[PDB]
Design a protein around this ligand. Structure first.
Ligand code: NA
Ligand code: NA
Ligand code: NA
Ligand code: NA
Lengths: 453, 452, 461, 453
């Protein structure tokens, strides 16, 4: 045995699965706002001999020898991360070891808070992320709500915007040690200056979790959270278009000096993680260099234009939008004026090769049948979609919604609806016709990555 | 821009760095017991379009659609994991989403314990892992010691073996909810039956963290912790020779066990976000390899090579902690030789031999380790046999002798290290040894791609 | 060797003979109590009968455990006393023993609350109480912007609720809003500086919505509740704590009442009893239990209802007299035993006022008012009726008390016009001859007035 | 109504109960080692107008005015506490507000430890106290084990002595922040110097909880824990013969100063307690002044002589003693060689007006029928008992044990044994005859306190 045989020769079962996934990505319309298509160059670094190296510790301060090259790679990744976000290295440092976005946030909390210290994030049904402290009325769900004490803040349900007035009021009472400014399903720009005002008043750290928007920030097409935040976390995928990994940025130097750096680095290792994934660090460095280019700014400008074109086309077809529009990469569609809930809509769309996700709307009464859908522009913009192409996407979505409305008129519960899509031959024929047109359209656009896997 | 450009064209700076790391791996004698060389097939899956799919949740119970293929891949990985360890799915389930070994352990604790509940693991200087609950006299180090309350168990310093008698005595007083059986620097086999006896008496869960030994267990060349443990965690790299990732195995069915739902919920939604599907696929590739006669032969050769290394060190007057080995590694006590592990590790590094300094029972300075930890897995993957490991030991002995000379000429550890670099006679001696080491190592095959 | 050098110790000697130093101190404290105008709303004067039980051989009995379930034998009489105290507590509050139980062992009010939290909550579980500056108690979970003050905020996670600053009333709307976000496991309805009646029905509505326990901490008002002169928290709360002193006029101790029987049964009783002992306390103080039983029997009488009605009338008369003299009241008046004065329009803060009053033998407390800009200089004064009502003060006597207070406020205003910082004000009261003479004159008049009224307890100690 | 009426006139029901308890105390033989009889002078202070005064805070630092006299009383109590224990006020302070012994310990833990910090105390069945951190295999029992993390240390079962070697071994592993030296059922002197050695090695605070022995310490008839512990708690009752209350002593001054004083005072108030019980503080001060006298030293010497006389009389009759003897105020009798367990024995004794308590012995298999009895000398020594009188006490105990052995031979379960004592005419007559002789003997001795209540 050599371990030099190709995947296609040595594991045909897995090779066929990879090819099937690649074909699915190429023939569908990917509208999941957290999805993107990573470059071949980054993937070549991800599947490299860097996987083999144990390098616990930090550059120049490792537990094991033989780290001279991985030290250069980790330091290069740090420099490229600061450059991508236009950060003065005298004022900011970065930890490039977090395994993903969720590990990055957990490390921040572990670094800066004692167990049971208080955090506030946007509530999950209102557009926040699990790792911002989510628990339900009946059990603690995120580990952030088990090891720490969380209390959510809310949207103003009338406007769909974060209710900064109520956040200021409740933060004075709850006294959080850390407030998280960052979202998973929010179409507007966060008022980071207002968030900093609240944090300064109550003496909380401001963490900006920019995972969804990090590429837009790097491209300077929206305002930067780094102007106001103490700590910034992000994934390296999503709008940054890298391999899956995480980053923690922190202020350093004179504020009396900042005291984040040593605590953040210690929390990542030795407290929480083990050996870094050097292949991921290298792939991230490749993507961060791409994020510095004029090409990436044009891409990010096009993401904003495409989201806006999608929002406009939906308003023209009788849909509503939570918060009335978008200033970023995604759109929050309110399907309630159409009479079809988001659980039914997402499934019809899935069966015609359009991937979107159901989304809770302000005023919804049931989590099983939420009122809306979340639609994103990053992934298809990476396939060279322009505004006219996103208008064609909306035309396909509206066709799918119309099929759903007819199935709704012939079915009762969500389970009946779902089985009908598969069991009713007439419905099945209509979905197949729409799927063929969607896939013929989608296949005509280029795709980042390898050719077949 | 297409995103289809080759790394070598689009990022020459990074491409040169990758090639330099590959050259370092090919020219060195890798004796770090936790290191291995992953196959090209697994690396091809690791750097694939699977990176591009968000699949929070579990097969058939995802948050998002479009998961039909990733569902098949995750289910296949689960099946191959159970097959590699000879497990009946009626008795065992597996979660293939943990991002690494340390995330796997944290998910077990979060699943089964409340904050501040008690755990016992082998102390770090005695051969346990950070994630088994390590804190020092000075501060809480592992997050396992922050979110939970840990108390270590110890080696018997006279034998170098886990002191099962004292573990039982102290577990009765401390009342842990979970005891960890698993090591990072131990050359003998754990008495899992005795660990089960202690856990049954005090009503604690038994977690076996088999990360260091997982390939040996899969190959059935040493006894299996699955005979006795409630939960088993492991890395997918190290002796399993896969991409970096983790696994959690758990008992299910009649005992009924109530681990499955808690374990899966702790991984997601409690701790992690989207799975790394490219890692899951790469792991599945390596697990299929681990089921083969090839892999049993590999693991048998790992044991033979560790024994050959131990025997060669004994013949040259080295002492071994616990007197020898029953697994993939050797624990050398350099104290009787007159050189400590910090000094030896650095000399060896400078001649392209990577090993680990290692705390020994007879150490008198809690700061400077007395020994070295030497492993056979990585070089065995390069087709090294017993005679080749005897040659490795001769190179080590040359390096140790250089270290002894430098020690006689220098005071502090930092003075020793600087002397290796700046004393011209010493650097010439190191250069000569490095060249013989590297020309020996380069002639063996290497798993993976040709140049990166 | 004669006299005391020829007399063996018996432990039966009188305090006045065996410890003259302590006897003189006790008499000095009694004289201070008799000659002052006690306006601290949490103060009262305990009966001689209860004090005779408090200083008794019951001090000598260890009785860890509960009646019929003790660790040690010889408890037959202390069992009867503890059971009698329980029965009298339920009787005083008109409670059916099939629906309510009571634990009579808590050492004081603060131990009672801690036992409830320990019984019903896990460490770090969430509690909400009225904020301290807004009229809550420390034991309802107080921490400052700077550190954790009450042990309730250390072992549990507290978040306050607030007054409506414009009305001076508890903001029930905001409590409901924030309880939905914070998700408390227990909400406390009870105050230390609040002049109005708590809407216990609304508190129970909030608790039912968010699935929290409602604890009523009625320490300040317990006598008024027993006398049925204000509405009872027992109509809406499932746990009630109280001190046995204050308006109940007993020895210092605590009580925990809890629902029991059919709710499917309630599950409070065993947890509450176990938290008191063995979890938190050691041997009960049987002398205090007996003294409490004496006071609880007093609280069941027509005499005590007339006392409690007079407390209400006297607080109202004090409030009216203050309004007639130009003072402002937080919430505009009182429905209970105390009055919250807002001195800000008069131009004198509560720290200055409280110190002037103390120097003329009137004890009151400075009190934070809504809108205050400094805790060192709170805007108000809290004035209570229970203690002087126990000395047979009636409405006209409280009007005379207000006349004295007004003279003290006027002295404070004059000193304020002559001094800068609070420390300068305080020093001026002692060192300026003209001011000290004016204080001495007012003090003489206060003390002759106060000494004329009767006093519960022993004659001289 | 004046509130000046006597208890006998105003509450005849309660008055009769007080008289019945007084008669029970006078006619019985009190052998509970934690019991004593408080002086009339202290009781007169306890039942005084000091009950009426709210004085939250500390002398000169109160929340409310009018505290000039209670300030003098509290300071006098502090001075008398330091005098009773031979302490230099420049080196030691004391907090006199704890409501009882258990509140004193909880305040120390709250002052010096964070929630979930580690404590070690002697296991409850081995002679420790609940408040030193007791939990069973199935439930956390003491609040000390809920809010803090406790692990017990043990006796050497062969010798009946604290196993200092095993304490040192396990303290190195468990890393307690505080170790408690103090017992509720131990007949030997604690090696405080060894305890301090262990604490110094592992960097733990040493707390001496001297509640059982405090009067012996004050009288200087046994060695003082203040030579080796820098924090000491105690009850003010038991061997100190005061009203029920607690004390916390702590080192202060140059140690770089000690930092105990402010943390301990803050923990007592405002953290844990409310208004002090000034009547108890005054009663404690009265008892502490008594504890400074030659009278009290002679009393305490007699306590030791009486416990030794009791032990020797039991040994002469063939009883075994746990640890083989006594060095303090109590005796641990092992009844197993006689064939009668402590639950059976304690109940027979109770029915003849002798109060003792069953006590777990090393090797016992059941807590329902422990092997021994704990017998104390303080209470009867306060009634002028001397050595010959304790020999008479042992004569009565032995008669009771013999009755218990006869009943045991005629009955099966513990419930049958207990029923037989009440329902068998011959047994009830034997008990009545012994009870009459015990009570005739006991009534002849004097009694501290009031005449009838
Ligand atoms: Na329908
Ligand atoms: Na040297
Ligand atoms: Na002024
Ligand atoms: Na029998």
């Amino acid at each position: 045995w050599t371990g030099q045989e190709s995947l296609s020769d040595s594991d045909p079962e897995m090779w066929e699965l990879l090819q099937r996934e690649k074909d699915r990505q190429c023939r569908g319309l990917e509208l999941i706002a957290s999805e993107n298509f990573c470059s071949r160059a980054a993937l070549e670094a991800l599947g490299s001999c860097l996987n083999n190296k144990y390098s616990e510790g930090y550059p120049g301060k490792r537990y094991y020898g033989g780290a001279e090259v991985v030290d250069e790679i980790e330091l290069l990744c740090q420099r490229r991360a600061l450059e991508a976000f236009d950060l003065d290295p005298a004022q900011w440092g970065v930890n490039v070891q977090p395994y993903s976005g969720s590990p990055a946030n957990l490390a921040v909390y572990t670094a800066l808070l004692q167990p049971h210290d208080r955090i506030m994030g946007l509530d999950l049904p209102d557009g926040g992320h699990l790792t911002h402290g989510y628990m339900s009325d009946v059990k603690r769900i995120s580990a952030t709500s088990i090891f720490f004490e969380s209390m959510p803040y809310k949207l103003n349900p009338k406007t769909g915007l974060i209710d900064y007035n109520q956040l200021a009021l409740t933060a004075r009472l709850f006294r959080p040690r850390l407030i998280i400014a960052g979202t998973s399903a929010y179409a507007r720009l966060i008022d980071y200056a207002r968030m900093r005002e609240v944090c300064d008043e109550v003496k909380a750290h401001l963490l900006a979790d920019m995972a969804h928007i990090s590429g837009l920030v790097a491209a300077k097409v929206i305002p930067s959270p780094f102007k106001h935040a103490d700590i910034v976390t992000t994934t390296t995928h999503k709008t940054l278009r890298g391999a899956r990994s995480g980053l923690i940025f922190y202020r350093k130097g004179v504020k009396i000096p900042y005291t984040f750096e040593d605590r953040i680095n210690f929390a990542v290792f030795p407290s929480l993680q083990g050996g870094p994934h050097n292949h991921a660090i290298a792939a991230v460095a490749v993507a961060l260099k791409q994020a510095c280019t004029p090409m990436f700014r044009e891409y990010s400008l096009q993401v904003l234009k495409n989201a806006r074109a999608m929002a406009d086309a939906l308003l023209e077809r009788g849909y509503s939008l939570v918060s009335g529009g978008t200033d970023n990469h995604l759109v929050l569609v309110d399907l309630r004026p159409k009479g079809l809930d988001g659980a039914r809509a997402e499934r019809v769309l899935e069966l015609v090769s359009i991937t979107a996700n159901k989304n809770t709307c302000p005023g919804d009464r049931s989590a099983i049948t939420p009122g809306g859908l979340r639609l994103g522009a990053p992934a298809l913009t990476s396939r060279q979609f322009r505004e006219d192409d996103f208008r064609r996407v909306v035309d396909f979505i509206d066709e799918g919604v119309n099929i759903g409305l007819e199935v709704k008129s012939k079915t009762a519960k969500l389970q009946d609806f779902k089985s009908f899509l598969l069991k009713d031959s007439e419905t099945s024929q209509r979905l197949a016709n729409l799927r063929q047109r969607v896939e013929q359209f989608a296949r005509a656009f280029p795709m980042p990555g390898f050719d077949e896997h």
